[PDB]
C-alpha cells in the first residue's frame, strides 16, 4: 500500500509523538534544564498560569520567560551552537508550526520565537525565551539541541520539561489582547459563573462551576480536541478553536462531550438540571472517552465557557430572554388563529424559548473588515444552519448588531434568533390566512452576562441589537436582508389597547392574572377575549392546555378596563415540567371591526433553595465540615433524590442519594471538605428527583491561607 | 417523568421518504351530503405527451410524472358529477416529508385561480367536459425539490373531503434552468443541453502538457437514479425546506460524497492497492456506484477526485442544477488558505527530498454548479466551485465550497463557502529555500506562474476542452491579479512570507513517450549577462502519484556547464524505459527538478516538470442494426502491452442508454496476449450515444477506451 494522498499524514494529535534522534564529546552536552516552573516563581506568576493544579511549565504565548541550562562545561560564543526547540505532535514539521527551533539572539524581537542569553554563570545559561503570539497553543516537549561539525546532538525525551503555551489575554500583539485588567481577571481568571434562567419578568440565577484550572481539566481540554482531530496548524487560532470545539460540546453518535435531551425523564443517564459545573463532566468525558448524557443548552455553554477560559480565551456566558432557536434565519414567527379569535394550536407549531444561553469568545478578526473583533456568539447547541444541524458561530457581536451578515460564521442564524418578528395569521375555514398584526418587541426582549463585580446580571441587548423602532436597526436589517436573512411576509400591516400581566409565584401557591383594556375610540365595541395556558418546557413546547377561559366585554368609549382571574395551585400541580414553565395566551376579536388584539406572557413558579452551611475553620489545608440541607414543601414524597455539592478549590463535585423524602420533611447532608484554594469561595449545590428537580443552592465562603 | 418532546413541537421534517396520513375526511365542530366526490385523476404523464417534453423531463427511465418548479403543466381530475363553480370548493394538495406544515412550504394547497400568476402556487380551469375539469397547474419557482405526493381536497361547510394515498400520482419537481425565475435559470439552449440534459462527459487528466481524456457516464436518466438522489438527502437527513435551494443542495450534497466512517457514498482511497474494493480508476461512470450505494445503503469503495466529481455531477443534473467537471494542471489541495509552497534545497543545490513534503497534484477535479447567490453581493451569480474531495478547512476535513467564481477570480473570500481555499488552489506560489547545515533558511526565488496553470472543461458542443483558466485567475503579473492578491489576503488568505526577490535563467522540456519508450528531457539555460558564469546542474526524476507523492528517485544526474556572456546552452538527457519500467504507479506519472547552482553569483536556478507515459487504449467495435429496441453485439478488447502477465483482470463496459454497467474478469492475460468480450446489447435510447470501457488489473490500470455510436429510432 502507498501513501497516495499525502507524504505526511495529518499531525492532529497533541497526545501523538515522534521519537527524536540524540544523534542525528568536546561538544556541549546538557546536564540539566531548570524551568523555575514552581508556582510561586517568576514565570507562572506573570504568566498567570499559577492557578493550574498542574507541576508542568505553563506560559502564555507572545510573552518572554526564564530557563537555565546547565551544560557539561562552560558555553563560549566562540566555538558552540545550540539551540532550545518545541516539538508538538508526531508530525512536526518546522513549516507548519509544529516543530520550533529557537534561535539565540542578541535581543528579543516582537512576533518571533527567539531566545536572549541574560545570564553566564559558570556551567550554566539562563535565558529569557519569547514565543511567537501566533504560536499553536498545546503542551509541546523541549528539547535542547546542540550543532556541530559532524551533526545535531539532542537532549533525550524529557516529561518533566513539556510545556504548555496558551493564549495570552494580557499580550497586546496575540488575537485574544483584552486590555482590561477587571475583564481579563472575569473573563479568564474567574472559575465560578453566573447562569440566568427563568423568564423576562423573574429571572432566576444559579451558580456554575467552571473549573478550568482544576485537576486534568486542561489535558481534557486538549484531549477534545484531539478527538476532534483538530490539525495542529489551526490550534493557534483562536476563531478554527472556537470554531472546532464548540462543534465537540453536543454529541452526534458517539463522537463528542454530551448527549443533548430534553425530554424531562432521562432515563440512562443525568438530568441536564443536576449538573453544578463542568468538571465533572470534562473528567468523565475523557476518562469513559465517550459522550456525557446528559444537557441542554446552559449545560453546553457551561463546559464550552470553561473549555474557552482553560485554553486562555476570554469568555463568557450570555443569556437571552425569547429566543427563537431553530429561525433557519426567517425573521418571522407564526402565531396562527381560529376567526373567533382563539388561538389554533394545531398549526401554531413554532415555540419561542422563554430563555436560551450561548457563549462569547474575546478575539480579533482579521479574517473580516476592520471592526468586526471583540466578543463573537458562538452557540453549541445545535439549531438547522446553512450546512445542517449544527453549532453555530462564531458570529461577530458587532457585525450581527449591523447587520452585516454575510461575515461567518452562521451570523444570519443568531440574528434571527435576537431579531425576528411574531406574526398573527387567521387561518380561515375556507383555507385562506390573513394576517391581523406584528410583535417586533417580543423577541430577544433582554440579553444578560454575569456582571463583573460579582453575581449581578449587566444587561448586554444593545450589544446585539440598536433601539427597536429607529433608524439604525432599521438599516441593519435592510443589509441583514441583503445577506442571507430572510423576512418574506410583507407587513403592510381598531384603537384599542389590550396588555395583561401575570403574578410570579412559589411552586404550590395560586397566582392572579389581569388582563386590561384601553379604548381610545369614540365609539362602542363588544369584544370576545381568550386566555390560554400551558405547561411548557423552557424551550416554549407546550406539554398541555392547563386552563382556558373566555371573556365576554364591551367597552365603551374613552373608557379602560381591568378584568381579573385566579388560578389555583390545582390546575397545574399535578401537570408541570422541569423548570416549572407556564405560558398565557391572551387573544381577542373586536366584533364590530375584526380586528384581532394578541398578547403573550410566560412566568415560571418559584422553585425552592437548598440550604448551605459551613461549621469549623476555613483555610487552605484544613477541614471544614460542610451542611447541605434540603426541605421538601410538596405534599407528595420525592423519590430516588440526588444532592449534588460543588466549589472549585473547596471540594471536587460529589453526589450523595437519598431513596425518598416524606412531605415536609429535611435531609441533611455532611460532608468535611479540605480546601485547596485561598480567598472568596463558593459552595454549590442541585438536587434532582424522579419529579421535582432544577433545584439549586449555593453558599458564598471566605478561606484563609 | 413524560417521555416528551421539549426540543422542539415537530421533529424536523428531513425525509422525503417518510410520509404522514391525511385524513380522507377530517370534520370540526358540529356536523348538523354529497359534495364533490373524485372518481379519478389524470397527470399525461406519457413520456412522448406534453408535459414532459416541454418540461424536458422525459429522457427520465421512470413512469412516475416529473416536472421542473416555476412551470405550468397539466392535469385532469374526474368528479362523480359536474364541477359547479356555483358552489363547489376544491384544490389541488401536494405534500411533503413526515411532517409537513404549510409555513415550510412542504404542505402546498394550490388554490384554483381565474389566471396563473407569476412566481406562485396556483391552478388554472382550461377545460370543462362532462363530469371533467382540465387544469393548468403553475408551481412556485422557488418550490422544494423532491416526490411529493398529490391529493384532491374539497371544502364543506364543515371541514374537508380528501382523496386518499394514491402512489401513482406522486410527482417529482425538479429545478428549472428553462424558467427565468428559478434561481438555476440558464439562458439559452446550447448551455442547457450541456451541462443539464447531456448524461455524458469528458474527464481531463494527465498534465499541462499532455492532456489526456476519457469519457464518464454521468447517467442521470438511468432507472434508479433520482430516487437514489433523493435517498442521498434523506441520508445526509437534509431539512425537506433547504431542499429547493440550490446552494444549499450543493453544499450538503457534496458532504456526502466522500464517507467518513458508514456515512456517505465513496470511500477515498489512495494507495494504489484498493484490496477489498474496486480501484478509483476502474469505474466508467456514476450508475453502478450509486445504485450500489442506494442497494447496500453503506458507502462504495473506492474513489478519487474524478470519481467524487462525476458523482456529484450527476446528483447536479439529474436534479437539475446545471454542473460540470473541471480540471485544474499543478493543483495545490490542502493549502490551509496559504499561499506558498515550499521546495527545500540542500546548500549545492540539490533538492532536500527528507524535508521537501508538500506535493502539487498534477492536475485536481472539482465541480462547479450554476445559481444566482442572493446571499452576496449582486455580480457573484453563476458558476460555483464546490469540491468535494476534502481538505483542510475553517472547519475540519471537509467538502469546499460553493464558492463564486467571480469572487475567488477577485479576491472577495470572505464570501461563502471556503472561497480562500479554493482560491490558493489555483493561485499558490512555489518558495525554494536552502536549508543550511547550521540550521538556518535562505529564501532563493518564487516561482508563481506553476500552480493553477491550465484549468479546464468539456467544450459545449463537443468532446474538445474549453480553457476557462481566465474564470479563475486575472493575468499573471499584472494590477488585476494584484489587486485580488490584496483583497484575499484582507479575507483569509494567507502569504505570511515576503518575498523581497530578484541574470540568467533556464527552463526545461520533457518529451511526452508511450509506456515503455524511451524518451528525451533537454534543459535550456539563457544567460542575458555580460558575464560569463560556471553552474552545477542537478536532474533528479520520481515516481509519483498523480497528487504529486513522490515513491523514489529513479533517475539522478549532475552536470557543469560554461555560459558565455549573451548566449543560451542546451543539455540533453536521454531516459531509457529500462530506468523507470517496473517502478511505475497508476496514472504513471513521473516529475523531473532541474535545480543549478551559478557558481560566481551563487544564484540558484529550479524548474519543475510532470509527464505520464501513455497507456494503450481498449478497443471497441459493434455490429448489427443499431436501432432502438433491437440487438447489437459490441466487441470488446484489450491487448496487454507489457512483457509481464496481468492478473486478475477487469474489464468494465457502459454506455448510458445502450447498456448498464458490466464487468468481466480475466484471471490472467499472457504478454501480449489479447482477450475479447461480446456483449449482446439492446439500446433503448437513439440519437449519438457512447460506449465506453476500463481495464484494471493487479498491476496496469487507468486503461480506458470508448465508441461512438449512432442510434436510429425505429418505425415508419
Ligand atoms: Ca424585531
Ligand atoms: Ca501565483
Redesign the interface.
Known amino acids: 500500500?502507498?501513501?497516495?494522498?499525502?507524504?505526511?499524514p495529518?499531525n492532529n494529535s497533541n497526545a501523538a509523538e515522534d521519537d527524536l534522534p540524540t544523534v542525528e564529546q568536546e561538544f556541549l552536552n546538557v546536564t540539566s534544564v531548570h524551568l523555575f516552573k514552581e508556582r510561586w516563581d517568576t514565570n507562572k506568576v506573570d504568566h498567570h498560569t499559577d492557578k493550574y493544579e498542574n507541576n508542568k511549565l505553563i506560559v502564555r504565548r507572545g510573552q518572554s520567560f526564564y530557563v537555565q541550562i546547565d551544560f557539561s562545561r562552560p558555553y563560549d560564543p566562540r566555538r558552540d551552537?545550540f539551540?532550545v526547540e518545541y516539538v508538538i505532535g508526531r508530525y512536526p514539521?518546522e513549516?507548519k508550526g509544529t516543530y520550533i527551533?529557537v534561535?539565540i539572539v542578541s535581543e528579543l524581537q516582537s512576533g518571533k520565537w527567539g531566545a536572549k542569553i541574560v545570564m553566564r554563570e559558570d556551567r550554566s545559561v539562563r535565558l529569557s525565551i519569547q514565543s511567537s503570539p501566533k504560536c499553536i497553543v498545546g503542551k509541546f516537549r523541549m528539547y535542547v539541541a546542540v550543532?556541530t561539525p559532524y551533526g545535531?546532538l539532542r537532549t533525550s525525551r524529557n516529561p518533566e520539561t513539556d510545556t504548555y503555551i496558551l493564549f495570552n489575554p494580557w499580550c497586546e500583539d496575540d488575537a485574544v489582547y483584552l486590555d482590561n485588567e477587571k475583564e481579563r481577571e472575569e473573563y479568564v481568571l474567574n472559575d465560578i459563573g453566573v447562569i440566568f434562567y427563568g423568564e423576562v419578568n423573574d429571572i432566576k440565577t444559579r451558580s456554575w462551576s467552571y473549573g478550568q484550572f482544576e485537576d486534568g481539566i486542561l489535558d481534557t481540554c486538549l484531549y477534545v480536541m484531539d478527538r476532534?482531530?483538530?490539525?495542529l496548524?489551526?490550534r493557534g487560532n483562536p476563531?478554527?478553536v472556537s470554531?472546532?470545539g464548540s462543534?465537540m460540546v453536543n454529541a452526534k453518535d458517539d463522537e463528542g462531550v454530551l448527549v443533548?435531551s430534553?425530554?424531562?425523564?432521562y432515563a440512562y443517564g443525568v438530568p441536564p438540571s443536576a449538573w453544578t459545573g463542568s468538571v465533572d463532566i470534562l473528567l468523565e468525558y475523557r476518562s469513559s472517552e465517550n459522550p456525557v448524557r446528559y444537557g441542554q443548552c446552559w449545560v453546553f455553554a457551561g463546559v464550552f465557557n470553561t473549555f474557552l477560559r482553560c485554553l486562555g480565551i476570554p469568555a463568557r456566558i450570555v443569556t437571552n430572554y425569547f429566543s427563537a432557536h431553530?429561525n433557519?434565519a426567517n425573521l418571522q414567527m407564526?402565531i396562527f388563529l381560529e376567526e373567533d379569535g382563539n388561538v389554533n394550536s394545531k398549526?401554531t407549531?413554532?415555540?419561542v424559548w422563554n430563555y436560551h444561553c450561548w457563549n462569547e469568545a474575546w478575539m480579533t478578526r482579521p479574517?473580516?473588515?476592520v471592526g468586526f473583533g471583540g466578543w463573537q456568539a458562538v452557540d453549541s447547541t445545535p439549531q438547522?444552519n446553512?450546512?445542517?444541524?449544527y453549532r453555530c458561530g462564531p458570529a461577530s457581536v458587532q457585525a450581527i448588531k449591523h447587520g452585516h451578515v454575510?461575515?461567518?460564521?452562521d451570523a444570519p442564524f443568531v440574528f434571527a434568533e435576537v431579531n425576528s418578528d411574531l406574526i398573527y395569521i387567521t387561518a380561515k375555514?375556507?383555507?385562506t390566512h390573513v394576517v391581523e398584526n406584528v410583535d417586533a418587541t417580543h423577541i430577544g426582549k433582554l440579553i444578560v452576562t454575569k456582571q463583573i463585580g460579582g453575581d449581578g446580571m449587566m444587561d448586554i441587548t444593545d450589544t446585539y441589537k440598536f433601539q427597536e423602532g429607529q433608524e439604525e436597526e432599521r438599516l441593519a436589517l435592510e443589509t441583514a436582508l441583503?445577506?442571507?436573512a430572510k423576512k418574506p411576509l410583507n407587513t403592510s400591516r381598531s384603537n384599542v389597547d389590550m396588555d395583561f400581566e401575570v403574578e410570579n409565584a412559589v411552586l404550590g401557591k395560586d397566582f392572579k392574572l389581569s388582563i386590561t383594556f384601553r379604548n381610545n375610540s369614540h365609539n362602542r365595541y363588544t369584544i370576545t377575549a381568550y386566555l390560554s395556558a400551558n405547561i411548557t418546557?423552557?424551550?416554549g413546547?407546550?406539554?398541555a392546555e392547563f386552563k382556558k377561559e373566555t371573556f365576554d366585554v364591551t367597552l365603551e368609549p374613552l373608557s379602560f378596563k381591568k378584568e381579573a382571574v385566579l388560578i389555583q395551585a390545582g390546575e397545574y400541580m399535578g401537570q408541570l415540567?422541569e423548570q416549572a414553565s407556564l405560558h398565557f395566551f391572551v387573544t381577542a376579536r373586536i366584533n364590530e371591526t375584526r380586528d384581532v388584539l394578541a398578547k403573550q406572557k410566560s412566568t415560571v413558579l418559584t422553585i425552592p433553595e437548598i440550604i448551605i452551611k459551613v461549621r469549623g475553620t476555613q483555610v487552605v489545608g484544613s477541614d471544614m465540615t460542610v451542611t447541605v440541607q434540603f426541605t421538601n414543601p410538596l405534599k407528595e414524597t420525592l423519590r430516588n433524590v440526588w444532592v449534588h455539592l460543588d466549589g472549585p478549590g473547596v471540594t471536587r463535585p460529589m453526589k450523595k442519594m437519598f431513596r425518598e423524602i416524606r412531605p415536609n420533611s429535611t435531609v441533611q447532608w455532611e460532608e468535611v471538605c479540605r480546601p485547596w484554594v485561598s480567598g472568596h469561595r463558593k459552595l454549590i449545590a442541585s438536587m434532582s428527583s424522579?419529579?421535582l428537580r432544577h433545584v439549586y443552592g449555593e453558599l458564598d465562603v471566605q478561606i484563609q491561607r
Open positions: 500500500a502507498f501513501g497516495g494522498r499525502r507524504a505526511v495529518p551552537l539551540r514539521q513549516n527551533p534561535p550543532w545535531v476532534a482531530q483538530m490539525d496548524s489551526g476563531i478554527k470554531r472546532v462543534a443533548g430534553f425530554d424531562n425523564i431553530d433557519d407564526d398549526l407549531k413554532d415555540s479574517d473580516l473588515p438547522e446553512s450546512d445542517g444541524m454575510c461575515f461567518q460564521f375555514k375556507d383555507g441583503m445577506y442571507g418546557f423552557y424551550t413546547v407546550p406539554k415540567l424522579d419529579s
